[PDB]
Paper text:
Co-crystals of the SMAD2–MAN1 complex were obtained using an MH2 domain of SMAD2, in which the C-terminal phosphorylation region was truncated (residues 262–458, SMAD2C-dC). The final model of the SMAD2–MAN1 complex structure contains three SMAD2 protomers (chains A, B and C) that form a trimeric structure, although we used SMAD2 lacking the C-terminal phosphorylation region that is needed for the trimerization of SMAD2, and two MAN1 molecules (chains D and E) that bind to SMAD2 protomers. The electron density map indicated that each SMAD2 binds one MAN1 at its β-sandwich region. However, due to the poor electron density, we could not build a structure model for one of the three MAN1 molecules. The SMAD2–MAN1 complex structure shows that the SMAD2 MH2 domain binds MAN1 using the hydrophobic surface of the H2 helix, the strands β8 and β9, and the L3 loop. The Trp855, which is stabilized by the intramolecular UHM–ULM interaction of MAN1, is the key residue for the SMAD2–MAN1 interaction. The side chain of Trp855 forms a stacking interaction with the hydrophobic surface of SMAD2 that is composed of Pro377 and Cys380, and with MAN1 Leu860. The side chain of MAN1 Trp855 forms a hydrogen bond with the main chain carbonyl oxygen of SMAD2 Lys375, and Gln766, Ala769 and Gly858 of MAN1 form hydrogen bonds with Cys380, Lys375 and Asn381 of SMAD2, respectively. In this region, the hydrophobic side chain of MAN1 Phe770 stacks with Trp368 and Tyr366 of SMAD2. By contrast, in the SMAD2–MAN1 complex, the second stacking interaction is used for the SMAD2 recognition; Leu860 and Trp855 of MAN1 stack with the hydrophobic surface of Pro377 and Cys380 of SMAD2 to stabilize the SMAD2–MAN1 complex (stack 2).
Numbering used by the authors:
A (entry chain E): 762 to 866, 878 to 888
B (entry chain B): 272 to 456
C (entry chain C): 271 to 456
D (entry chain A): 270 to 456
E (entry chain D): 762 to 888
Write the structure that this text describes.
């Protein structure tokens, strides 16, 4: 049941940074590699990220750490502001029964990615 | 002997005896089994001052919350059809949130509410900060959760004593380690 | 179900003392001061810093108290006190066709059949067809409330059990466990 | 004669806090620390109270090592290990010295007080059976000892009743209670 | 170790006689003779009494009962009023971790037990 099931809290100072400083995001707790099969599942997590940020037009790079038992996904956007709206849609959200948190952190990509 | 102790409340009045967890896995539900070492059944607890709002809330506890202790970590799993709201200061420390932050656990979701070694690290860091820092760590050994209704900066009720049904978790392991430091301070 | 019953003692609307768990088939609830007998629940030793004068007088009249025995799937109440006891047992009241809230005075030396296991089990099976709420409300059948010396109800000035100075609450752990087995599966 | 020679209930103002402690060993300590599974320490610092106010919060920081209660040679003693004083109201002790039964006695740090003697209670039990039922009934208060940490109560202090002190405990002596029971039942 | 550590209560109706009846005092729990060595230790107790009663000018003889299993010390004053002012400073006081209580003692019994007090009329003071 890899679906989004609401937020854990309302985002503000007591759980989020004041304003976006960087166009790069660290996203953890997106999956459990022990319970994943093959090499195709990583696209589904990439798609899960893009649908949750479907209104965003700034996301230009996603890489998931298949070896990360921490469920890590890395995202680079065009501007820190575009990473800010990807932050607000991802930080503190529930996906596949796990709580997703976000941290700020092929070098140059400029075409936006979108959900299929 | 018991890795945790649970106390059940209704608004600001405690209800029922204290439950002592003898087994690694435990569920706090609203059903009526009085002699299961793995279930803390709230449906048998009486309260002659119980109001209508509390009575209705206890109908929605259902299968409740599952608490299990594995690998030096404690987890909370919402089995109810309504959400549960956990206030765990050790969890908030790990992610850099306000110590009083309440996080909603939707049905079917799971949350890491405590890690022993992180508490041990904060216990050692707080000895350097004085007596007040170490004694205030008693709040880190306590986890509070409410059924159905939450409290905090997002909800109408400001304090956990305003939620109709809530519990308080005591982690006896961390409390014992904190004691060994507190006595020597 | 290691303990067939659990007893909680009240004074007006405040709980007093720990909960007593019945380990043996026979049990007595008296007003004396034996703190370590697994067969007697002595109320005379329990303190209450909110105790009023009326409660103080009532506790002198408890005396030998009430006898609770569980044999052959039936529970009985025997008044050993020199004052009457007042039992509110929905299983007893249903069996005789009275209002579920009916309180029955037990004079000294008298005995009343307050509960039957198979009778409760039959009503539990009859109610599963009636819905979840019908089965949950059967928790009141697993609870029996009795008061010492003075009673409460439509004939007395006291309307609620929270107005009597000394009363107890019985939990039948057997019936509660079966009710759990049905409630969870619905 | 019973399994636990005494049982202790902890209070905060007029509200009980925590479960009842049952003394399994002859010596016992009631401190304000946070050990939940030591049969020799009754730790009050771990007990929660959602109605706790600031004055109680401040008083709980000064409990410290607390009070030591030990039962030897048919006598039980209270020794103040805290850095603040404790205040004991023991009718059996007041009887021994001829004080008012409600007298509260302050135990400064490092001091020791004999709060109960078995033979004296046994003698008073035998004297009161001759005096009627009510005389033996009123002896139930002799089996109870109440003490408070840091702050005392009585005619000398601003707090008049033990229910006004922020932290106090109540001891039930199960030995005397059993002897009192065996006499009361046969009367 | 032998130091005064405050009072156990304020002295009044509930723990003391209404007024001093005799110029002699019996003071118990001042020492434990089983744990004392030699013959010099009694001076330390005598000084402890005089320090606690330094304001009093009536004490003219103090004797400790070395055999007293209760640790009793006896004090003779000039007048019952001076014995009353020594009472309020000693009764209900803590010394060496033990609670000190005081009873009034007849003059004849004091002189019968300590005839050295006959020729003591000069007030004593602490060194």
């Amino acid at each position: 049941s890899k679906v989004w099931q609401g937020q854990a809290f309302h985002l503000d100072r007591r759980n989020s940074p004041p304003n976006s400083l960087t166009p790069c995001l660290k996203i953890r707790n997106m999956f459990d590699p022990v319970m994943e099969i093959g090499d195709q599942w990583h696209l589904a997590i990439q798609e899960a990220i893009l649908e949750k940020c479907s209104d965003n037009d700034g996301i230009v790079h996603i890489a998931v750490d298949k070896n990360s038992r921490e469920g890590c996904v890395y995202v680079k956007c065009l501007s820190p502001e575009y990473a800010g709206k990807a932050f607000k849609a991802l930080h503190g959200s529930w996906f596949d029964g796990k709580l997703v948190t976000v941290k700020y952190l092929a070098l140059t990509s400029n075409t936006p990615l979108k959900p299929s | 002997a018991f890795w945790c102790s649970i106390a059940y409340y209704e608004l600001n009045q405690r209800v029922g005896e204290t439950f002592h967890a003898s087994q690694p896995s435990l569920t706090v539900d609203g059903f009526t089994d009085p002699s299961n070492s793995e279930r803390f059944c709230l449906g048998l607890l009486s309260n002659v001052n119980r109001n209508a709002t509390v009575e209705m809330t206890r109908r929605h506890i259902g299968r409740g919350v599952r608490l299990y202790y594995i690998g030096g970590e404690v987890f909370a799993e919402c089995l109810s059809d309504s959400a549960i709201f956990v206030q765990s200061p050790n969890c908030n420390q790990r992610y850099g949130w306000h110590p009083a932050t309440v996080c909603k656990i939707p049905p079917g979701c799971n949350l890491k509410i405590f890690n022993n070694q992180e508490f041990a690290a904060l216990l050692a860091q707080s000895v350097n900060q004085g007596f007040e820092a170490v004694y205030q760590l008693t709040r880190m050994c306590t986890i509070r959760m409410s059924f159905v209704k939450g409290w905090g900066a997002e909800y109408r009720r400001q304090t956990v004593t305003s939620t109709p049904c809530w519990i308080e978790l005591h982690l006896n392991g961390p409390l014992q380690w904190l004691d060994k430091v507190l006595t020597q301070m």
